[PDB]
Each structure stands twice: as structure tokens, then as C-alpha cells.
Design a protein around this ligand. Sequence first.
Ligand SMILES: Cc1n[nH]c2ccc(F)c(Oc3cc(C#N)cc(C#N)c3)c12
Lengths: 415, 545
Amino acid sequence: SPIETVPVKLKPGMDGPKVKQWPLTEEKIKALVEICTEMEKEGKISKIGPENPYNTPVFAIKKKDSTKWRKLVDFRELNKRTQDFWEVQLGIPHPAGLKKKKSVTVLDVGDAYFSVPLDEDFRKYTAFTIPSINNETPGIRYQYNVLPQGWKGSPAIFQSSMTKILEPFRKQNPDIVIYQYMDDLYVGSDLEIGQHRTKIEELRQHLLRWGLTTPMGYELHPDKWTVQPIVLPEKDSWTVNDIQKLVGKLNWASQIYPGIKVRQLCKLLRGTKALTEVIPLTEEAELELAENREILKEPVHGVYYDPSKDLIAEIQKQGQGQWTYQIYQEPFKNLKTGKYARMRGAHTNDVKQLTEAVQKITTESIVIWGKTPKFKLPIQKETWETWWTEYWQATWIPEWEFVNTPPLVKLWYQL
Amino acid sequence: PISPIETVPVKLKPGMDGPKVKQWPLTEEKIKALVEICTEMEKEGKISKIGPENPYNTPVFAIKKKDSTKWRKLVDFRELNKRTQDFWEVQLGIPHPAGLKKKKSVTVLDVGDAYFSVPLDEDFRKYTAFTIPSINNETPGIRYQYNVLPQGWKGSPAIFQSSMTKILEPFRKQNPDIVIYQYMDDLYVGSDLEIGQHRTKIEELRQHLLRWGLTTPDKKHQKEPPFLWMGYELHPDKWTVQPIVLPEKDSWTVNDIQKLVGKLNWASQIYPGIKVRQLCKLLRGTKALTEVIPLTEEAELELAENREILKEPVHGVYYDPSKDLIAEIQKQGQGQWTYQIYQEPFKNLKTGKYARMRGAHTNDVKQLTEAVQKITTESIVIWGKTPKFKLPIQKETWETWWTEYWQATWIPEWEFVNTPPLVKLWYQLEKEPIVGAETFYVDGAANRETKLGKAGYVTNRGRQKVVTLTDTTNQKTELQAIYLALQDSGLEVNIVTDSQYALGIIQAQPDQSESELVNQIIEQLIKKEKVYLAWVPAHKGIGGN
Ligand SMILES: Cc1n[nH]c2ccc(F)c(Oc3cc(C#N)cc(C#N)c3)c12
């Protein structure tokens, strides 16, 4: 077994995580205790004594598509304190091409980690507790011996063994983009779908040869990731209310889009006219109206991804199963604004939906910038905290604040 | 004894090293006592004599001190505590009576000399040294170091625990039918086994601890029900809060209102009904524990209902993991809600209450969900499962509101329960403009230094008004403006503001507020019959804006 541990070092002065554990259902506690008594006979983890002051939270998800309980460790914290190690020393590079593929496939390769082993000295940072109910039993405390799934140091370590794994496949199909982000490998190609699907089956065996099984995706197509112009409505008979409402949208986009103008139409609004009252459009305004319309489907202009900077994501509830989204680094400076819409069943589940859009958007940043965003989630903390897993399925977790949508911001973006 | 259990490897916080604190000299008297105390302790393996070598020292003291005439050794672990590493708080919450499974037979075992019966990591004894000084600190003191968990020391709680966890392990394993609540230095065993294999299963549990260093009580000593535990009264088939008594005082001090408000939330847990909003409003000092404060009529009015509620006993049932939990909430008055969790109609596992989000622009629809929320969290905590929700709200009311609101809002499982007051929205802003309704284009402003704002409206029917304001804010003026338009508009009005602020506030149908300007506007709005409200960038054309 003996493969030299990669001496992992926390950041200078920064201390290990001491994150509280969330009270869990007894269903996931049971399922964890199992997933965990199995992982220890495989020597993957080891109980730890109170002599350990650290703690990362843990939870139980339900295997995207393949429903059967999976452990999910929340290492966001440890990952921040570990940030020099993964991001800097052993940083894994973002293919610019991945966002352009006719198709991209996500494969989970976190079972790869279990094999390779963890720096005897780093393993304390990795402790987690498996709660009881009503505090009879104390927590079943554990700690890792082999790169964890969820900790970003791992892919950064394994990088060298992954390039070996893919070297013949990469050699044989040099136009296939492989990009590994955490526990997933992103596989992109311009192949036809059946060829793609095939290239990914082949790629799957190569993996199996090392122990990374699954007897694909999310099947993504970044190629077809087109916009959402802020979208103004098509002319006719405009009331005062509607002029007042476009001058509003246009005002706001003017803040993001350059060639914007609203003086032509704003003109008509110097009044004390009743808003049901109709008003003719002095042509010069159909000119202003249109000039903007053209712009609206055309890439802000001076907005560029700055790698030094965090990503931010806002999400609006639009009702009707719709939700919209903006991804930017500096407020108003949108680098990406799509929209996720309801796929029924849990027809009336507002959380079921927010949780899916947070993963759709997280996925796409991962494919566009190779990083996840910080969500401004139009929801109440506790509610999210309580229910965010009953529907969660990604192996990672991005960062989140809880916000309060401005009534008009939900508006402009309304499609 | 001194458990054979492994030791847990204790270390010092990093940039550190053992404390080296000086022994102020001691009274001949206390010196003699420390010396007797230490001698027995030593004879029991609890401590051990030491070299002049060991540099460390944490001071000793000895207190009697009244109805005692027998004293005890007190150790200042204060410094040693600022240098001992950090430990795991392995008990994130303490058992609530309402989650204690309803167990046939229950046994209570309190370990004797708990920290003293557990080894302390060899390489660490060294740091725990104290010194019994010689009469005038003349000679050199007698020096010791612990072999066990010092009382008062940092990691004793943490360590005594792992130590008992491990011991209890292979017992539970070969005895899963058996429930061992490990609290502090107690062991609460319960099972549905009958005094038969029960008081015989318990003497087996015991036997295991002794084989392992831990003394406990015989059936002759093991206490019996009700167990007056941690503020509660536990019988085998029902629990309640421990005996509450509201003071027959004529003149209430801030302090004594606080204790009332405390006891009042304690009882709160099983005594459905309890209100505390009116006595809590009084709690807004000043300060002064000894400050006697006058009770509002509303207060004397609460305390009285509470006095009634607590007339006679209310007890609560225990849990059955096979039956569902039903949670029912009710509207006790403004931002005042109650619930009760039961499994069988009306035999209550437990009660509780919920008071506003300081109710700072909110409506009952928002308040219920905060309660359903708080309640959802407690069941997870307590029972490992959410309950079924019976709410004084209508299915359509909930959906009209949820569908329309910008925050993802999500109640799990519920049913209407026609138990007035039912929860309702008090008015609704229109979706489209009222044709044939006056458009007040409202406005408002404030001067920062002066702090003098104006507030007016100007209509499409040519009207106007321009009220003048004092000691005001840009916010406060944009709402007084909207207030004005509501006052002089009648039944159906359109109102165009430049205030994202107010729009925002009104749009979420508040039906209560901390601000009375906001309160006026609520009183309006409900009166009207049609109110479309709309927004415009200010400093733009927008005449009226
Ligand atoms: C162990 C038990 N299982 N069910 C149950 C019902 C009632 C009751 F009393 C009790 O024991 C106790 C539990 C705790 C706890 N937690 C505390 C005490 C005490 N004293 C006793 C139990």
C-alpha cells in the first residue's frame, strides 16, 4: 500500500475548522453510521478521541439519479484554510475550451481518492461527527486517512495520478478536453452525441482500471449556452404606466450596458397624467427604444473575468416555476445571466427549485471560469438550512448568504 | 478506583509550556488540612509526590467555611487552563424530556468520584503540579502532581466522557435494546425489559463499569421517580416542568420581572397558553435589578392569564418512535403564536410559543411560517423527524401568497384546522392601473443638516398638497408622502413613488409594523378598495416624480 504522503500545510497562522454539526434526521444518521462503519473496516477513516478540537459538518445526500444514500462532508471551511495548498501550489488549470464544446460530461471520480493516503499530520483537520438524537449517545467522531471527497487538496494531490490515468486516452483523442474540478471530471468534445457517448464509455474503462467505477453526466452542452437580453416589450399602444415601466427597465440596464439612452421616452413622462392614459410614440423614441433593443443581446462590453476576484450569483424568484440568474464579480458588471425553469413532479416545491438552480449555475461556472459562485439566495436561512439536502445532489457545496430580492430587480430580469 | 481505560493524550496550546505560578503562603491551619487531604488522595493513587525538578506549579487553597468544619482542597487551574489545548464539546445539546422514549423500565446511575476514577496522560501529569507550602514558606513545600482528572481542569469534562463512551461501548453493542443516556457524570438507562431482565440487566451494566474503574449505586441506592432533574420532574410515564411559583409581590423590580419572564418561558414548554409579550415590554431599562417598575394594565392582564394557566398541573407524554408527530399552531394575539406537539390527540408530548421577528414589517402569513420553521427545527433536534402541520390557514390563502412572494417559502406537510383567528391577508395591491382612479404622483425629501423634509402629492386631476416635516429622514418622508396620497384619495387610487424603500415595504403586504407611519398606511390600504402602486427613477423626466 505505502505511497508517500504529500506533506499538507494549513495556511500560516490559520487554524483548523471548528464548525458545528447540524441536527440530522435519524434516517441520515442511520445511513451515515452505516456508510461509516463500512469505511472504517476499509480503514478509510478512524474514530478520534476528544483530544481533537476540530470539526467539519457532515450530511447525507441521495446519489444524483442513482438513489442510494451518500455521505457529503461540508469542507468549505477547511477548504478556505487550505487554499494556499490547493489553489496555489497544486492549482489545477481551467481549459478555456471546455465552455465551447458541443457537449460536456461530468463523471464523479472521488472514489479515486480513497486509495491514495493522507498526510498523518494533516488528518486532524478532517474530523467529523455523526450525531445522535436527543443526545443519548455522544457523537460518533471520526477522522480521515485517505484524501477526503469534498476537500480540494485532494484533486490537487491526485493530479499526478490522474494525468497518468488519462495519458493514453488523452494521447488517443487530443481534441478531448478533460478538466477535473474536485470530485468530478469534465469531459468535453465536439463529437456527434453517439460518438461522444462512446468516447465517454471508453474513457470510463480506462478509469475502472484504477478503481473508479460506476455500473453519463449530466449531459451538458455549453455550445448552446446563449443569453437573455434584458428584453423590452414590442411596441404598439403604450400607456403611461408602460412608458414609466420601460424607462425603468432601460434606466437599470443603462447601468450595465453602454450605448443605452432613455431621454426620448423619458420625455413623455414629465406630467401628472393618469397612467391608464395612452400616449403616442414620437418616432425619435422608437429610435431610442430600438437602439437599446439591439444592444440588449450584446455582451455588456467592458466586462471581463478577473481571476483574482470571487464570483457572485443572484437568483430571482419569477413564479410559474421560473427563476432567473446573474453572475458577476463587480455589481452590475454581469458576466453571465441565464435562467432556470421548473421541471415538474414536486410541481409546488420552491426549495426543490432553488436547490436545482443553484446547482445548474454552479455547474456552469465550473465549466466557464472553473470556480463556483457565492449565492445571494432569495430565501430564509433556517428554511434553507433545514431542507437544502432533501433535494441536493452535487458532491460540492458553494458559498451562500441569504438575501432579500429588490422588488424591481426581479422585474427587469423578468422574461 | 481509577479506570484501567487508556489515557487520552493531552497537550498544551502550541506556543506554550506548563504554568509556573507562585504559591502565596498559607495559614498554619489550611496547611495542616491540605496536608491531610493530600495524604488520603495520595494513598488512593489520585496524586503523587514529586522532584524539585518539575518547574510547574498551579496554586492550592483550602476552604471550610461555615456549616462545614471539614474543608476541601481548591486548585487554581486558571493559568493551566489558558494553556491546555482546545477540546471537543462532544455534547452539542442536552436531552429534552419530550424525546425520552417511553420506556417500560428506567434506571438511574450516578458514577461516584467521576474525574477521580479516570487516568490522566502521563506526559501531562507534570503540568498539574501544586505545592503545599511550609509555615512561613520557610522550607520547601510538599509537591504533588495529579494522576487523575483534576476537578476544575479544562479537559476533564471532555476526557471523562470519551473514557465512559469507550467503556459503555461493547455493552450497548451487545445490548442495543438498551438506552443509555450519557449526561455529565450520570448514566440514565431505560428499556422495555420488565423489572425481570431489567434490574438484572442494570446490575450487569454496572458490573461492566466496575470491571472498568467506575462505582455506582445498588438498587438500595439507585434513586426512584419522580426524578427532579435539570429543572424538570420525570415520572416514568409523564414529565412536566419542575414546580413553578409566581411571586405575590406588590411592586415589581426589573430583576424579579426577569425571573418571572424566565420561569414563565420554562413553564412555557408544557403549559400551553403562556404569554410573555406584555411583561417583556417592561424589560427595557434603564437597568437596576433593584429598580421596581410599574406594571402596565396589559401586563397585570397577562400575568393573570398565566396565573390561571398555571392554576393546576399540566404534564406531558413520552415518545413512541413508531407514531407520527402532529404539530398545531395558533394565533394568540399580535405576533404571538403557540404550538403543541402530540402524537395521540391531545396527550401532548409538548408545548411552546413564538413571538415576532421583533415584527418589523410583517404579516401573519410570514409569522406562521417562521413558527412552522422554528417548530420544524426542534422536532429534528428532539425527535429526528419533522411533524405534520395543522395550521389556522386556508390552503388557497397559503398558495396565493407563496406563489406571489419573491422569497422561496416552503411548508412541508399541512392541513387547514378551522380554529379562529384564521390567518389572512388584509388587503391586496392591484396588478394593473385603476382606469378612472386618481393618480397621485407622490414625493418626499429631507435636508440632512437641518433634518427638515417636505412631503406632498400632485395629481392628474390637478390637485395638490405639500406637507412640512420636522426631524425627519429621506425614508420617513417618502412614506409620509404615500400616506398623504392615501388620506386624500378615496376608494381607488394610483400612487407613483420614486422610493424603492416604500414600494418594497408595501408590496409584501405588511399587516403590522414597529413604525406607526407604516401603521397609518396599513390602516389606510385596508380601507381602500383598489390600490395600484408604482415606481419611477427619480431625477428622471417623470413629472410627479
Ligand atoms: C432513560 C429513559 N428512557 N425513557 C424514559 C422516560 C422517562 C425517564 F425519566 C427516563 O429516564 C431518565 C432520562 C433522563 C434523560 N435524559 C434523565 C433522567 C433523570 N434523572 C431519567 C427515560
